[PDB]
């Protein structure tokens, strides 16, 4: 079924009413964020709007709104934001949540799509956990449309909801397979200058006349894969460059969205969903995309693909 509301969908997708309540609460925060971004005041140094009687940069505004939603749910024990990665007690029980409140906040003024990412874990820990342990993950996407993209672990597909004029979130798409195509989204392209293996990968994409779409914002750049049902996103390090992407706040949540969509993730060797978060600031390189492009990523950077070898053993 499509065309159902987020509440109706969640009743079908999970027996866990507390997880559904948390995802509805977070949808209200996303709706409010989208409106605060839509008529923010953008200046030399920041884009701002108000939270109550105060004026706040939109990323901080988003952070407040998300903590407030988690507290209102009553089903959150700890929340952690990528802004201030200390664990905050949200005075509830059931789940702990890590979020990146506004990926792309620095380029709101340019009017490119920006977004929110969050992962939901059962229990009271946001370290010593893996992405595979998430109950759900989701993104809010603030573009010419406002969408809310959700994966419930253990229930098929990644599901897109459109914000309607009357405030409701309507189920508009389900993705269950990522196919092979000719789209690439190359993060940290500068690394090709001194990582010859990344350069070789990029050169392959260019030689095969792939389409380039990359904004530097993880939300849109990975959402496009889910929507188009094809593509490859990469973000690779070099000796001289370092890893910007956080496992807990960004990479694990997105990994669930991609893998629930029938895509694959990699850090070079393994699914990003099998990496333990040791510390909340832990960084990683990553790729997301179709099967063959992930094998290519792994073979080109590290010679051998574990994904390929994994597949060759479910075959035999």
């Amino acid at each position: 079924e499509l065309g159902d509301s987020l509440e109706e969908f969640l009743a079908k997708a999970t027996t866990d009413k507390n997880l559904a309540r948390l995802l509805v609460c977070m949808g209200e925060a996303l709706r409010t964020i989208a409106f605060k971004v839509r008529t923010a005041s953008c200046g030399a140094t920041a884009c701002v709007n108000t939270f109550g009687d105060e004026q706040l940069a939109v990323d901080m505004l988003a952070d407040k709104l998300l903590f407030e939603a988690l507290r209102h749910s009553h089903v959150c024990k700890y929340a952690c934001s990528e802004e201030e990665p200390i664990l905050q007690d949200m005075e509830g029980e059931g789940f702990s949540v890590a979020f990146d409140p506004l990926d792309g906040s620095s380029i709101v003024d340019t009017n490119f799509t920006v977004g929110t990412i969050f992962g939901v874990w059962p229990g009271d820990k946001l370290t010593g956990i893996t992405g595979r342990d998430q109950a759900a993950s989701a993104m809010g996407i603030y573009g010419p449309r406002t969408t809310y993209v959700v994966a419930i672990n253990g229930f098929p597909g990644t599901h897109e909801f459109l914000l309607m004029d009357d405030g409701k979130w309507q189920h508009v798409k389900e993705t269950t397979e990522i196919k092979e195509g000719k789209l690439f989204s190359p993060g940290n392209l500068r690394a090709t200058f001194d990582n010859a293996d990344y350069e070789k990968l990029i050169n392959y994409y260019v030689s095969e006349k792939y389409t380039l779409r990359y904004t530097g914002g993880m939300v849109p750049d990975v959402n496009q894969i889910i929507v188009k049902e094809r593509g490859i996103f990469t973000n690779v390090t070099s000796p001289t460059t370092k890893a910007k992407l956080r496992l807990l706040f960004e990479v694990a949540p997105l990994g669930l969205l991609i893998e629930n969509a029938g895509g694959y993730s990699s850090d070079g060797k393994q699914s990003v969903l099998d990496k333990v978060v040791v510390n909340t600031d832990d960084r990683t390189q990553v790729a997301y995309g179709s099967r063959d492009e992930i094998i290519r990523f792994e073979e080109t950077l590290y010679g051998d693909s574990r994904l390929k070898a994994e597949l060759a053993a479910a075959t035999v």
Copy 2:
């Protein structure tokens, strides 16, 4: 001064009340297009919404809104859309307008920023003209914010208007300088496979650790230069790749926006504003950006930069 309405700005920017009427009418089309995109139904094959009694894909919907706005203005003789590049008589007098109704329409479903581009020429022709002859040019930008970016030829600056919640356009930025920075937006990157000059140019940017920002969509990709006051957009052809960008509907309009903002444009040899549109669907390579980036682009393609010589001949 900022905070003024579109109408207040236009009364300061030009004495031409007919040009102002046209630009206000177009702003209302842009406001409507933004809504149609925001609420479109994106299905298996298209993103669709309503126009009167019809459901239409959003690019075609935008096309109809823009022709309707031009007819309603009473001040447009001919209009030409990139979707069907023939002249259409809008039953008015004063200006002829060329437009690209929805740049990026095929990626609406991805929720990436998309936009409208148009140029406004006095009189009755849209061929045998140059970009420099425009009265004005503008883009509508459909992102998480809805903006209308306007240049009035002969009046300083490029001017950004934000759509407020009350449905009105408010002046929020004037750009008059484009500085040097480390941002590139490389269109047609596939051409580096078999255009060694473009390959070298991209090497340069990568060697200097530039930030990449490109979504296929001329509008956001060029708008970011105006907003950040830095950067370089390029689109260069190779023997195995066509030139996709149209001079009339896209490149000349955006040239006026960039040059009014204190940047520069180039086809490799000259401002895009000096190229004659011979046929409505004529194509061109292009770059837009800061002074030094445009000099580099020209030297990369030809060894010498006509821009560099021009700037010297004045200094």
